[PDB]
Write a structure and sequence with these properties.
Strand order of the largest sheet: 2-1-3
Oligomer: monomer
Structural class: mainly beta
Largest sheet: 3 strands, antiparallel
Order of helices and strands: EEE
Shape: globular
Number of domains: 1
Number of helices: 0
Distance between the termini: 4 Å
Radius of gyration: 8 Å
Strand content: 35-45%
Length: 29
């Protein structure tokens, strides 16, 4: 299970799914 969480276009990929601000393409698992 990984969140693919680009802030704008800045990707960070790890072992988590937190809730985040509107307009992030945070795609859990």
């Amino acid at each position: 299970s990984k969140y693919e969480y680009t802030i704008x276009s800045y990707t960070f990929r790890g072992p988590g799914c937190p809730t985040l601000k509107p307009x992030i393409t945070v795609r859990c698992e």
